[PDB]
Structure 1
Amino acid sequence: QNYHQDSEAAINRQINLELYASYVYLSMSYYFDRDDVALKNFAKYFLHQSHEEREHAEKLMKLQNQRGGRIFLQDIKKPDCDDWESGLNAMECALHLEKNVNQSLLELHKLATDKNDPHLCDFIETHYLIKELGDHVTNLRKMGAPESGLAEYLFDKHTLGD
């Protein structure tokens, strides 16, 4: 059965993807830490999420070993850019990224068809994250971002404070 090696690979693939996203949000965070950007709650938001994605990846590694598979690690690619230009951009990219990661994640499920159904909980979580980022993009746009620095200031406070 190619199944065991198909899944063991789909896992290894998903592991590197979640690590990738972790790296991405890590980059985004410290972009907002720098003094020419200086949005602390944007920075917090992404560092948190970066840790979420890392947690996801470690869980997938524990799964691989549980199922008797072997973990084949790949490089963690630097994210596309190191300057994210704006909060609305960084949200927009993250929206794109989660959708792409969700894509393979879905592929991962349809190929498994477990009795155990382990990762379904994290699959449910990504859909919340997607609706949220869309919600966040939507709000920054209607406020006049990216070009209005005030909008992103007030969003950093009122939305990303609470």
Structure 2
Amino acid sequence: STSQVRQNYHQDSEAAINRQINLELYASYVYLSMSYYFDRDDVALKNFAKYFLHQSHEEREHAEKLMKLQNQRGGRIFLQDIQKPDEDDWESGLNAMEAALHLEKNVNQSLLELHKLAHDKNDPHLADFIETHYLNEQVKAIKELGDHVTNLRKMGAPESGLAEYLFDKHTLGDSD
């Protein structure tokens, strides 16, 4: 019937965790697609590609985390298909980064709704889990991407390819 370890875990919490798992997996797929878009010889921005590939591994980690939680709280995982990304040819580093920002805002909205739920089903554990392991990472992600979009713009992207080249070398070539 129910697992020996289930307790205060509501069914809406569970379904939302499966949906969120599928979502994070989706984000990883998107970031992968963008990554190898910038690996293409007619784009050739190694640091853009490394960057998005890192983001893709991070998303995969987020999903696996959520699955570990599902099993943890006594819930049951159910995997769904992983929707192909909306694009196969992202136009530029700037455009890829804007799509990034929109994606991260999506995932953040989903996580905020999930926290609303865990709070309404009076599930504190799930609440503070979402808080400490996802929310801040989502704010930091959205911030980083916003700064990148701002700089790419102030430089003259996507008009000037010199811009995206320099941004690739001087911003994505060191740090996180």
- Using the TM superposition, give the Cα deviation of residue 72 of structure 1 relative to its aligned residue in structure 2, in angstroms: 1.1
Contact kept, 8 Å, 1:14 with 1:104, in 2: the verdict is yes
Partner of 1:80: 86
Provide the rounded CA distance (Å) in 2 between the counterparts of 1:141 and 1:123.
Answer: 36
| CA deviations over 1:90-135 (Å, ceiling 9, x no partner) | 0000000000110010111111139998998998899999000000
* Structure 1 residues not aligned, in runs of 5+: none
Distance 1:127 1:67, change over 3 A: closer
Normalising by structure 2, report the TM-score.
Answer: 0.82
Provide the rounded CA distance (Å) in 2 between the counterparts of 1:46 and 1:37.
Answer: 14
Provide the rounded CA distance (Å) in 2 between the counterparts of 1:112 and 1:121.
Answer: 5
Partner of 1:133: 145
Identity of aligned pairs, percent? Answer: 97
Contact kept, 8 Å, 1:105 with 1:123, in 2: the verdict is no
Structure 1 moving runs of 4+ over 6 Å: 114-129
Distance 1:38 1:156, change over 3 A: same
Normalising by structure 1, report the TM-score.
Answer: 0.89
| CA deviations over 1:67-108 (Å, ceiling 9, x no partner) | 111111110010001100100000000000000110010111
Give secondary structure in 1 for the equivalent of 2:90.
coil
1:9 and 2:21 aligned: no
Contact kept, 8 Å, 1:102 with 1:123, in 2: the verdict is no
